[PDB]
């Protein structure tokens, strides 16, 4: 699974699968946590199936999505 620092108002899942799912079909994704009233730690993860694609994604911590290049620390 991987983690992005896009923490946008709405994780473009469908667009997410287009990119991340592009590295390899996605099983399910993950968005930032709820509440949002403690420390500055809001992002959006995504889980896949095998493990290889993470190797790739993680290899490019800073990719690009649609019109943004959120960060990407595997998860």
Coordinates of C-alpha atoms in Angstrom, one line a residue:
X1 CA 0.0 0.0 0.0
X2 CA 1.3 3.5 -0.4
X3 CA 0.7 7.0 1.2
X4 CA 0.3 10.4 -0.5
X5 CA 0.6 13.8 0.9
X6 CA -2.0 15.1 -1.4
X7 CA -4.6 15.4 1.4
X8 CA -6.8 17.2 -1.1
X9 CA -10.4 18.0 -0.3
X10 CA -11.3 14.8 -2.1
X11 CA -8.8 12.0 -3.0
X12 CA -9.4 11.6 -6.7
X13 CA -9.7 7.8 -6.3
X14 CA -11.0 7.1 -9.8
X15 CA -8.1 9.3 -10.9
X16 CA -6.0 7.6 -8.2
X17 CA -6.6 4.2 -9.7
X18 CA -5.7 5.7 -13.1
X19 CA -2.2 6.4 -11.8
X20 CA -1.6 4.1 -8.8
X21 CA -3.9 1.5 -10.2
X22 CA -1.8 2.1 -13.2
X23 CA 1.4 0.8 -11.4
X24 CA -0.8 -2.3 -10.7
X25 CA -4.5 -3.0 -10.2
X26 CA -5.6 -1.6 -6.9
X27 CA -7.5 -3.6 -4.3
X28 CA -8.7 -0.7 -2.3
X29 CA -7.5 2.8 -1.4
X30 CA -7.3 4.9 1.7
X31 CA -7.8 8.6 2.5
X32 CA -6.8 10.8 5.3
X33 CA -8.1 10.1 8.8
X34 CA -11.2 11.8 10.2
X35 CA -11.6 14.3 13.1
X36 CA -8.6 16.4 12.0
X37 CA -8.3 18.3 15.3
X38 CA -4.9 17.3 16.8
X39 CA -1.6 17.5 14.9
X40 CA -0.7 18.3 11.3
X41 CA -0.9 14.8 10.0
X42 CA -3.4 14.5 7.1
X43 CA -2.7 12.5 3.9
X44 CA -4.3 9.8 1.8
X45 CA -3.0 6.2 1.4
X46 CA -4.0 3.4 -1.0
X47 CA -3.6 -0.4 -0.7
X48 CA -2.9 -2.7 -3.6
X49 CA -2.5 -6.5 -3.9
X50 CA 0.9 -8.0 -4.6
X51 CA 3.8 -5.7 -3.4
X52 CA 5.9 -5.1 -6.5
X53 CA 4.2 -1.8 -7.6
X54 CA 4.9 -0.3 -4.2
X55 CA 8.5 -1.0 -4.9
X56 CA 8.0 1.2 -8.0
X57 CA 5.8 3.9 -6.5
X58 CA 8.0 4.2 -3.4
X59 CA 10.9 4.4 -5.9
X60 CA 9.4 7.8 -7.0
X61 CA 8.2 9.3 -3.7
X62 CA 7.2 12.4 -5.7
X63 CA 5.0 11.3 -8.7
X64 CA 2.3 13.3 -10.4
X65 CA -1.5 12.9 -10.5
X66 CA -3.8 14.7 -13.0
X67 CA -2.6 18.2 -12.1
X68 CA -0.8 17.7 -8.8
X69 CA 2.4 15.9 -7.6
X70 CA 1.4 14.9 -4.0
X71 CA 4.2 13.1 -2.2
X72 CA 4.2 9.3 -2.0
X73 CA 5.7 7.4 1.0
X74 CA 4.7 3.7 0.6
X75 CA 2.4 2.3 3.3

